[PDB]
Structures are given as structure tokens and as C-alpha cells.
Design a protein around this ligand. Structure first.
Ligand SMILES: CC(C)c1onc(-c2c(Cl)cccc2Cl)c1COc1ccc(-c2ccc3nc(C(=O)O)ccc3c2)cc1
Lengths: 223, 11
């Protein structure tokens, strides 16, 4: 724990920005139909992007980075960060996530079976890791600060590696019996990358069937 | 080019 203080304000940041209960109540409260399911998912996503931006801002030395690479990182990690947060809802059964009803809506929102299947297979796998909130938080931070996104890569690594080290330590400090556990997590990140292509195809399908998104989502996903 | 993201970052 040489300087685990950075973990302090990361969890502070991770708990800081939150989805309003009035908005997440719609997952439970509203009609269940293909159209309403899609609209609720779109509202959740566009709200979560704003939560994401506020989390990213608070990250160590994010604001000191190059301005246009900051956009490149936000755009590159958006889908992956939403998959991770949604995974956390399903895995921990976050009350305000209403996971069983969230699942009903995802399974009837115009998404192909081809994408539903690996989506929920991913959710189950990540759940079986039995991760803590600090793991979810650090993985999210690591995912956001990826040096290999399209469009200097070096200064991103300076911000990311410290977080990878803290995650590396917490595995050896909270799972001593499995020293393949850190590797396990990193493997699931590669599985997470798989959903970038899936999501681009999902957007195409939705668009040709006359679905529109929000200005914010349209910007961050290049719609 | 990415006005809304800039706006959220600067707010
Ligand atoms: C734009 C819509 C149609 C969409 O397209 N692909 C996906 C999509 C799908 Cl269907 C699956 C995975 C990833 C994506 Cl982008 C989605 C919906 O994505 C979601 C994004 C965020 C959340 C979310 C995030 C945070 C939450 N926090 C709380 C809380 O209490 O803090 C409660 C509910 C939350 C819901 C749920 C679905």
C-alpha cells in the first residue's frame, strides 16, 4: 500500500456520480414492450455516459492530458465501460438496477440473439469472478485509460499503470490462493473488446429499423 | 467536432 491513497479517491469518484433513482425506477415501473424497452435502455445509456464523464474527469491526472486524446479515450471506452457497469448490476444485483427487469428489457429491445447470447455469457463469467467494488472500479478506470485506442499513447500509460499495479496488489492481497486471478480479470477485458464490434452491428440494425439515440450517445458512438 | 463531450469535460 505504498500510496494506496489513489484508491481512496478512485472509490470516492466511483461512488460520487450516480444515476438518479427517479430515472432507474423506470426499469421497474414502465410498460414492457419492444419500443418502451429500447427507450428506457437509451435513457439509461445516455445518463450513464454523463456519469462516466464525471468519473473519468476525477481520475488521477486525466485533466492534465491532451484535450483531443481525452475525447479519443472517452469514445474508445464508452461501450466497454457500460458493459462493465451493467455486468456489475447483474452480478451484485444492485437494487436500483432492477436486474431481472433490466434483463427483460435488454432481451426485448431489437437486439439479435447473436449478440444477446455472448452478452449474458459475459455477464455470467464476470459474476463467477466474485469481484469486489474496488475491482469493478479499478477495471473501469483501467479500461477508460487504455493507450491502444484509435487516434500520444505514452502519457496514457503513465496514468494507467499505477492503477494496474493497485489491481495487481489487491488480487495478491485479497485472493492469495489463486495467483491466476489477476490474469483472469485481464482475460475478461479481451472478452470485453469483443462487444465493440457487436455493438456497432447492434447500432446498425437499430438505425435501419428507425431507432434514433440521443445527441450525447450519437457523439460518443459516432452515430 | 465533439462539442457535447468537451462541454461535459469543461463543466
Ligand atoms: C442505447 C441503448 C439502446 C443501448 O444500446 N446498447 C446497450 C448496451 C446493452 Cl443493451 C448492454 C451492455 C452495454 C450496452 Cl452499451 C444499451 C443500453 O445500455 C445500458 C447502459 C447503461 C445501463 C446502466 C448503467 C448504470 C446504471 N446504474 C444504476 C444505479 O443505480 O447506479 C442503475 C442502472 C444502471 C443502468 C444499462 C444499459
Amino acid at each position: 500500500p505504498d500510496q494506496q491513497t489513489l484508491l481512496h479517491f478512485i472509490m470516492d469518484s466511483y461512488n460520487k456520480q450516480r444515476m438518479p433513482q427517479e430515472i432507474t425506477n423506470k426499469i421497474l415501473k414502465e410498460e414492457f414492450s419492444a419500443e418502451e424497452n429500447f427507450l428506457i435502455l437509451t435513457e439509461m445509456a445516455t445518463n450513464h455516459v454523463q456519469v462516466l464523464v464525471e468519473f473519468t474527469k476525477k481520475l488521477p491526472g486525466f485533466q492534465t492530458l491532451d484535450h483531443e486524446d481525452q475525447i479519443a479515450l472517452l469514445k474508445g471506452s464508452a461501450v466497454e465501460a457500460m458493459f462493465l457497469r451493467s455486468a456489475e448490476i447483474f452480478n451484485k444485483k444492485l437494487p436500483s438496477g432492477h436486474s431481472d427487469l433490466l434483463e427483460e428489457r435488454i432481451r426485448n429491445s431489437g437486439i439479435s440473439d447473436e449478440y444477446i447470447t455472448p452478452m449474458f455469457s459475459f455477464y455470467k463469467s464476470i459474476g463467477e469472478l466474485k469481484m469486489t467494488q474496488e475491482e469493478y472500479a479499478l477495471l473501469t478506470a483501467i479500461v477508460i485509460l487504455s493507450p491502444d485506442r484509435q487516434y500520444d499513447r505514452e502519457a496514457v500509460e503513465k496514468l494507467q499503470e499505477p492503477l494496474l499495479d493497485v489491481l495487481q496488489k489487491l488480487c495478491k492481497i485479497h485472493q492469495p490462493e489463486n495467483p491466476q486471478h489477476f490474469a483472469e480479470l485481464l482475460g475478461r477485458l479481451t472478452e470485453l473488446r469483443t462487444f465493440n464490434h457487436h455493438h456497432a452491428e447492434m447500432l446498425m440494425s437499430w438505425r435501419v429499423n428507425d431507432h434514433k439515440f440521443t445527441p450525447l450517445l450519437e457523439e460518443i458512438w459516432d452515430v | 467536432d465533439h462539442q457535447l463531450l468537451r462541454y461535459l469535460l469543461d463543466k
